[PDB]
Amino acid sequence: RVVTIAAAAIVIIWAASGFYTIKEAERGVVTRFGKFSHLVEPGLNWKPTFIDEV
Amino acid sequence: MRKSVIAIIIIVLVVLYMSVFVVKEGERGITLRFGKVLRDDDNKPLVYEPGLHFK
């Protein structure tokens, strides 16, 4: 059951560290891996940590 | 059932005290949730009149 606890911990860390907020005056540029992916509007958003950067 | 009731009362009171904010007469307030401002009435930015409002 310890492996299940570890899986829960890692998925919780994945969900918690992924959320980010950007100010209203700002607009985010999100790049999937090293390649540009899209533009994000000024609100709370979620991104996969270590996968894409804003 | 004595600690629980006083605890819930005090936390509710402190939450309400945090929630309330007053806009002075000479000023006007703009509210920010995360980054953006609140929009109302068909995507128009809203400004708070000098009255008590809840956040």
Q: How many residues would you count in chain A?
A: 54
Dihedral angle computed from the Cα positions of residues A39, A17, A15 and B37, in that order, rounded to the nearest 10 degrees? -50
Q: Which residue has the tokens 């000023």?
A: B27
Chain B residues near residue A44 by CB distance under 8 angstroms: 34-35
What is the spatial distance between Cα A31 and Cα A10, in angstroms, rounded to a whole number? 23
Chain A residues near residue B36 by CB distance under 8 angstroms: 24, 41-43
CA distances (Å), origin B38, targets A5, A25, A39, B35: 39, 14, 21, 10
Q: Is A26 on the interface with B (CB under 8 A)?
A: yes
Q: How was this structure determined?
A: cryo-EM
What is the spatial distance between Cα B31 and Cα B48, in angstroms, rounded to a whole number? 8
**Experimental resolution (Å):** 3.3
